[PDB]
Design an enzyme around this catalytic site. Structure first.
Site, mmCIF file in Angstrom:
data_model
loop_
_atom_site.group_PDB
_atom_site.id
_atom_site.type_symbol
_atom_site.label_atom_id
_atom_site.label_comp_id
_atom_site.label_asym_id
_atom_site.label_seq_id
_atom_site.Cartn_x
_atom_site.Cartn_y
_atom_site.Cartn_z
ATOM 1 N N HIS A 233 42.055 41.609 31.169
ATOM 2 C CA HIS A 233 41.623 42.127 32.500
ATOM 3 C C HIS A 233 40.594 43.199 32.104
ATOM 4 C CE1 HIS A 233 42.011 44.031 36.463
ATOM 5 N NE2 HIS A 233 42.788 43.037 36.859
ATOM 6 N N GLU B 248 29.773 37.456 36.479
ATOM 7 C CA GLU B 248 29.662 36.862 37.770
ATOM 8 C C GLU B 248 28.559 37.381 38.676
ATOM 9 O OE1 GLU B 248 33.659 36.760 39.619
ATOM 10 O OE2 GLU B 248 34.083 34.924 38.505
ATOM 11 N N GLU C 1 36.373 32.046 32.936
ATOM 12 C CA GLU C 1 37.345 32.754 33.759
ATOM 13 C C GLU C 1 37.909 31.802 34.820
ATOM 14 O OE1 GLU C 1 36.304 36.831 34.706
ATOM 15 O OE2 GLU C 1 36.809 36.436 36.806
HETATM 16 C C1 LIG Z 1 33.334 33.634 48.343
HETATM 17 O O1 LIG Z 1 34.240 34.742 48.332
HETATM 18 C C2 LIG Z 1 34.447 35.369 47.079
HETATM 19 O O2 LIG Z 1 34.852 34.582 45.989
HETATM 20 C C3 LIG Z 1 34.885 35.173 44.699
HETATM 21 C C4 LIG Z 1 35.674 34.221 43.770
HETATM 22 O O3 LIG Z 1 34.765 33.048 43.614
HETATM 23 C C5 LIG Z 1 35.652 36.492 44.730
HETATM 24 O O4 LIG Z 1 35.526 37.151 43.480
HETATM 25 C C6 LIG Z 1 36.774 37.478 42.894
HETATM 26 O O5 LIG Z 1 37.266 38.594 43.549
HETATM 27 C C7 LIG Z 1 38.556 39.011 43.153
HETATM 28 C C8 LIG Z 1 38.974 40.153 44.099
HETATM 29 O O6 LIG Z 1 38.223 41.325 43.796
HETATM 30 C C9 LIG Z 1 38.474 39.380 41.662
HETATM 31 S S1 LIG Z 1 40.160 39.677 41.094
HETATM 32 C C10 LIG Z 1 39.892 40.787 39.732
HETATM 33 O O7 LIG Z 1 38.899 41.785 39.859
HETATM 34 C C11 LIG Z 1 39.219 42.763 40.884
HETATM 35 C C12 LIG Z 1 37.990 43.720 40.956
HETATM 36 O O8 LIG Z 1 37.847 44.432 39.740
HETATM 37 C C13 LIG Z 1 40.537 43.436 40.493
HETATM 38 S S2 LIG Z 1 40.989 44.582 41.865
HETATM 39 C C14 LIG Z 1 40.788 46.185 41.074
HETATM 40 O O9 LIG Z 1 41.767 46.471 40.126
HETATM 41 C C15 LIG Z 1 41.617 47.671 39.412
HETATM 42 C C16 LIG Z 1 42.697 47.798 38.342
HETATM 43 O O10 LIG Z 1 43.962 47.589 38.863
HETATM 44 C C17 LIG Z 1 41.766 48.857 40.393
HETATM 45 O O11 LIG Z 1 41.596 50.103 39.689
HETATM 46 C C18 LIG Z 1 40.742 48.666 41.493
HETATM 47 O O12 LIG Z 1 40.990 49.625 42.519
HETATM 48 C C19 LIG Z 1 40.850 47.309 42.150
HETATM 49 O O13 LIG Z 1 39.663 47.153 42.911
HETATM 50 C C20 LIG Z 1 41.665 42.451 40.265
HETATM 51 O O14 LIG Z 1 42.812 43.133 39.782
HETATM 52 C C21 LIG Z 1 41.210 41.388 39.242
HETATM 53 O O15 LIG Z 1 42.137 40.306 39.086
HETATM 54 C C22 LIG Z 1 37.899 38.217 40.800
HETATM 55 O O16 LIG Z 1 37.597 38.666 39.537
HETATM 56 C C23 LIG Z 1 36.574 37.764 41.406
HETATM 57 O O17 LIG Z 1 36.138 36.611 40.752
HETATM 58 C C24 LIG Z 1 35.201 37.391 45.860
HETATM 59 O O18 LIG Z 1 36.092 38.479 46.001
HETATM 60 C C25 LIG Z 1 35.215 36.668 47.208
HETATM 61 O O19 LIG Z 1 34.622 37.585 48.130
#
Ligand SMILES: CO[C@@H]1O[C@H](CO)[C@@H](O[C@@H]2O[C@H](CO)[C@@H](S[C@H]3O[C@H](CO)[C@@H](S[C@@H]4O[C@H](CO)[C@@H](O)[C@H](O)[C@H]4O)[C@H](O)[C@H]3O)[C@H](O)[C@H]2O)[C@H](O)[C@H]1O
Ligand code: CA
Ligand code: CA
Ligand code: CA
Ligand code: CA
Length: 302
Positions: free
Chosen positions: A32, A136, A225
């Protein structure tokens, strides 16, 4: 033994191959964000993944934004630790410049060129290394033609100055889904692959057919990913559709890395909260996602 067997990877007619032209299919895990969950990335945990899961590739996800490398470049040390561990363990390693909220790769182009110049000078001679220059790209005004290809066209020569042959994975539009646009206007460098990312609770046949289009144009694709959950992370894991995707990738020999190795309480996480950072996990330390992914990697491992 993995790098010992395959040595230098290269692309041959859209296929990832080893130094004898034999198909190579890498299956492993992605970390992550290293700025949040770096304790899970170390020599012991990568060894345990190698020995108990059968991984043959480890992806170090160096976020640029969100408290990552741009604000605190000490996270590069974690990348180094991962690379050096991969070299010691004889597995492949992906250095991932993990853009996401910084949706256009050109936002930190200068920094990316500096970072990849440094990584490629340090590690370019090892076949273990794979570069992933823009996790991405996303957003309606971030396109292959205007933004992503030209970024790659500037970063790739910087790596090639130091490392003429290691594989470079290039992100695509719409969160690395738009591999068909990329396949209709491919880079010239022979050792490149285009990224394709998906979430089993969100993406299905339509994106599978888009990937088949890209492959039909001779483009190499690396699923660097993918998650077993929905992109949203609601409804838990979707292993039924995750297994359809697994078979899809196997049919086409696509390499992949699952997202992600962390104990965060989200469905895509492979570990339960409190899981040991250095590996040696009991079956109770693995989440439903992790249990399934481990099984997928073990059943193809030797
Ligand atoms: C068409 O709609 C879109 O599709 C995309 C996928 O094809 C989406 O992208 C995905 O969005 C996911 C939601 O954000 C992330 S999950 C991944 O990354 C997120 C962001 O960093 C984190 S949330 C993050 O965690 C931190 C640590 O805990 C915290 O400090 C912070 O506050 C919090 O924001 C999550 O834990 C991870 O698994 C996918 O990576 C991404 O591909 C898109 O969202 C959508 O609109
Ligand atoms: Ca920090
Ligand atoms: Ca230099
Ligand atoms: Ca090299
Ligand atoms: Ca330029």
């Amino acid at each position: 033994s993995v790098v010992e067997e395959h040595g230098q990877l290269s692309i041959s007619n859209g296929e990832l191959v080893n130094e004898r032209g034999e198909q190579v299919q890498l299956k492993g895990m992605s970390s992550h964000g290293l700025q949040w969950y770096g304790q899970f990335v170390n020599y012991e945990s990568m060894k345990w993944l190698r020995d108990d899961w059968g991984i043959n590739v480890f992806r170090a996800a160096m976020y640029t934004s969100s408290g990552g490398y741009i604000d605190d470049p000490s996270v590069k040390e974690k990348v180094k630790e991962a690379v050096e561990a991969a070299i010691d363990l004889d597995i492949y390693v992906i250095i991932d410049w993990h853009i996401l909220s910084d949706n256009d790769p050109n936002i930190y182009k200068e920094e990316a060129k500096d970072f990849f110049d440094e990584m490629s000078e340090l590690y370019g001679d090892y076949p273990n290394v794979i570069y992933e220059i823009a996790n991405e790209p996303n957003g309606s005004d971030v396109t292959w033609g205007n933004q992503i290809k030209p970024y790659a066209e500037e970063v790739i020569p910087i790596i090639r100055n130091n490392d003429p042959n290691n594989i470079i994975i290039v992100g695509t539009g719409t969160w690395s889904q738009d591999v068909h646009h990329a396949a209709d206007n491919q880079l010239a460098d022979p050792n490149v692959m285009y990224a394709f990312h998906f979430y089993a609770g969100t993406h299905g046949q339509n994106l599978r057919d888009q990937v088949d289009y890209a492959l039909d144009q001779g483009a190499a694709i690396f699923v660097s990913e993918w998650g077993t959950s929905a992109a949203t992370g609601d409804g838990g894991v979707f292993l039924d559709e995750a297994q359809v995707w697994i078979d899809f990738m196997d049919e086409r020999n696509l390499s992949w890395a699952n997202w992600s190795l962390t104990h965060k309480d989200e469905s895509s996480a492979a570990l339960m909260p409190g899981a040991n950072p250095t590996g040696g996990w009991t079956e109770a330390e693995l989440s439903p996602s992790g249990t399934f992914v481990r099984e997928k990697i073990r059943e193809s491992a030797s």
